[model samples]
Target chain A: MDPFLIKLIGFAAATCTTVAYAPQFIKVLKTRSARDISLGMFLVMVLGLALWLIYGLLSGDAPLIASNAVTMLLAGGILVMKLRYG
Target chain B: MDPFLIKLIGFAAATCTTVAYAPQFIKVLKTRSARDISLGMFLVMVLGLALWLIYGLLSGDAPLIASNAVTMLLAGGILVMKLRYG
Candidate 1:
């Protein structure tokens, strides 16, 4: 196994998680169709983003900060929908 | 505002994001109802986890590596469901 391959796996994984929040956010809001969206998962997702934001600041990285900021909002909104719909 | 408050906020955020994946992962698998689970988000989530893993190794943090590994597998599993069911 190559070292770069391992890192590439990590990068690919990280890349996929970004920006995909929009559709989920919008879908939940527009239709309130998040019954299938686990409440526990959203809770953890937002919390994780919050920590990532803090971790970014603790380490002082703009990419981590800005990315988590948008993600929190998007994910946080979906949680709102989950509550309203559920 | 205390410095501790900021750190606490970050910690809380991080905590919520963890373990919550299990429920989402389980729900999707049991019900096979991932139409609402945004594919784009899962893709980015996995990628972010991968980057987090690499970053963790680069930074030499055990927590990051372990947590992201578990999450990657769970979210990665969900992605498979999305593709299969979608």
Candidate 2:
């Protein structure tokens, strides 16, 4: 495969994962219920994404940094809602 | 930073994200309640993780493959539970 095309695939993958949290965040916001969501999962996920952001920064990888940054915000929002609602 | 140390950081990041879903999966299993979990989020996430796995395979990246595979399973499990319980 062309290198550019391969990069595109990776970018798409990152976008998918990054945006995946949006619906959950929105749902939690509208429903104002996070009882079913796991506190531990979000806690660890936020921490993990922080590390990922750092890794991307250290490696100077644009996609990793961008994707992880967005994901962290979304996931972090969900985590906060979970804590507040639960 | 040493290249090996950088790789280790990446590994840790991957591990964090991958295992982060475990608590949610277990919570859903134990509680049988996925009412608060968003179907759209998990649906999109599973698709996204599948893409990540493909990207990893195409790029021949071991950590990407390993981390995404485990995450997919965990997230997938949660999605299934959401469907069943919600």
Candidate 3:
């Protein structure tokens, strides 16, 4: 595959994963509930993304750092909401 | 900063993200409800993971391929449950 095409795919993949959290975040905000959401999942996921962010910073990988940072915030927000609502 | 430590962090991050879904999956299984879960989130997430899988295959990256594959399946299962139970 062309480098450009590969980059495009990567960008698309990153965008999808990063933005995917929006709906869930918005849902939790609007509903003001997260009874069915898994606290463990978000807890572990936020921790994982935090690790990823650290890894990115240590390695000087801009994309990894940027994407994981945004994801962590979104996921972290959801986790906070879950805890608060539940 | 050591390569080994970086690799270890990466591995840990991957493990966390991959396994995090289990709790959510189990929650849906036990509760048989997904009222609070967001449909768009999982749909986009699964799609994102699929693209990541493809990107891994194209780039011949084993870790990406393996991790995204597993994550996709787990997320996909959750998506299915959300649809079915909603």
Candidate 4:
């Protein structure tokens, strides 16, 4: 396998995961029903994602940044939704 | 930063996320209450983790494999728990 292919596949996979969580955020926002989400777990995940974002930036890895940034937004959205409605 | 140090930190971070989900798995199992857990989301995540694990193995990154293998187990555990009790 070529190096370019490897990188492309990796970046694509990360991107998919990041975007996949968006609907949950959207649903939470629309319904204001975040009762099921665990606040403690969300906080831990958001912080972890933030650190990963920083690591990506420092490493100059676009896949890492792209993926984590989107994920951070989704996770943050969930937290915000929870806070506002829960 | 030294290469070894970078690898160690990366590995550690990955390990944290993988293991972090374990408690959730255990809780879900113990309570037999997976009502709050989303089955679709969990399935997607398990598949994602499986790919990530394979990617790690192919890349020869122990951090990826260790983290993802643990994650796969926990995620798989949760899925089974959900199916059993949900």
Candidate 5:
């Protein structure tokens, strides 16, 4: 249970997972096949992101708030795209 | 700063944000339209969640690990749906 090792794992894992989901948002637009993406998913996702942002603010986790804020905008873009195209 | 208040905020934010993304996965399944939904977003998002989960585990924060686990599943569902329907 080395502190440095654990933190490194945490940071690495978190960074990778989050970034992994970034590409799928482009798939539909590229393939032009968003027939499977759900509006419900995005709406709820946005709400979730918003709540997390709030929580981060209230808890004084600057990292959480800042990250979630950026995430919302990114997720929001997908939602807007879905609405516009489909 | 009250510890209880901070924890509450963190818990609430984590819970809501994690849950919020749930429905979008459902939306694609129910509506079967993922045209506008970016494949990029979901991919990166899942990645992000995975990292967060790992971070939680490494940090010995039971809450972070547990919550992100559920979040991954929820988001995973959407990824599956998007692939299947779209």
Candidate 6:
């Protein structure tokens, strides 16, 4: 595999993963219904992403930092909604 | 930073992120409900994780491959339920 191809995979993966959360954010906000969302999952996920964020900062991996930051924002919204609505 | 500690951070980061999805899997399975789960989000997430899995395979990153694999399984279950229930 070419180095360029590998880089493309990494970049594509990062973009897809980060953007994937948008729909959840929109869905939850639009309906204001998050009854089915697992609070435990999002709680753990937020903490995990925070660790990744810290890891990215310490390691100076800008991609990791940016991806985790955006993902955290989206997940946080869903989490807050879950708590509020439930 | 000590080399050992950096490795610790990476391992901890990996563990936390991977384990985070389990709650979601269990939640959805227990209730057999995934109405609030965004179909679009999990659709894209699976695709993204697929890319990451491929990247991991190519790069020989066992952790990346393993992490995404389990996450995909959990997310895939949720996706199936969403389509079935919704």
Q: List the candidate 3 regions with Cα displacement exceeding 4 Å.
A: A1-9, A38-43, A78-86, B1-9, B38-43, B78-86
* Model 5 TM-score, all chains together: 0.61
Per-residue CA lDDT of model 6 for A1-86, tens digit only, reads 22445545666677787677567667667766555556556667777887887887776666667766766676555645555654
Sort candidate 4 into its docking category. acceptable
Write the residue-wise lDDT of candidate 4 on B1-86 in tens digits.
Answer: 23445556766665566454455557666655555445566656655666676676666666667766665666554544447554
Record all residue pairs in model 3 with backbone atoms less than 3 Å apart, i.e. clashing: none
| lDDT against true structure, model 2 | 0.68
Model 4 lDDT vs. the true structure? 0.59
Which candidate has the highest lDDT of all? 2
Winning candidate number (TM-score): 2
lDDT of 1 by residue, B1-86 (tens): 22444445444455457555457666667765566665555655555565676676664555556656655566545645556554
The residue ranges of model 2 lying beyond 4 angstroms of the native Cα positions read A1-8, A38-42, A78-86, B1-8, B38-42, B78-86
Which is superior by lDDT, 1 or 6? Answer: 6
- In CAPRI terms, model 6 is classed as medium
Report the candidate with higher TM-score, 1 versus 5: 5
Residue A3 Cα positional deviation in candidate 3, in Å, after optimal superposition: 9.2
How would the candidate models be sorted by lDDT, starting from the highest? 2, 6, 3, 4, 5, 1
Model 6: share of real contacts kept:
0.72
Ranking by DockQ: 2, 3, 6, 5, 1, 4
Q: Per-residue lDDT for B45 in model 3?
A: 67
Name the fnat for model 3: 0.78
Each candidate's fnat:
0.76, 0.91, 0.78, 0.06, 0.88, 0.72
Q: What is the interface RMSD of each candidate, in Å?
A: 5.7, 2.7, 3.0, 3.2, 4.4, 2.9
Model 3 interface Cα RMSD in Å: 3.0
Q: Candidate 3 lDDT, tens digit per residue, A6-85?
A: 54566667778768756766666665556656555566766677777777776566666667767666654564554566
Question: What's the distance in Å from true for residue A38, model 1?
Answer: 4.9
For candidate 3, the TM-score is: 0.72
Error of 2 at B14 (Å): 1.4
Q: Which candidate tops DockQ?
A: 2
Candidate 4 residue spans exceeding 4 A from truth: A1-5, A18-30, A77-86, B1-4, B18-27, B36-38, B76-86
Candidate 6, superposed: residue stretches over 4 Å from native: A1-9, A38-42, A78-86, B1-8, B38-42, B78-86
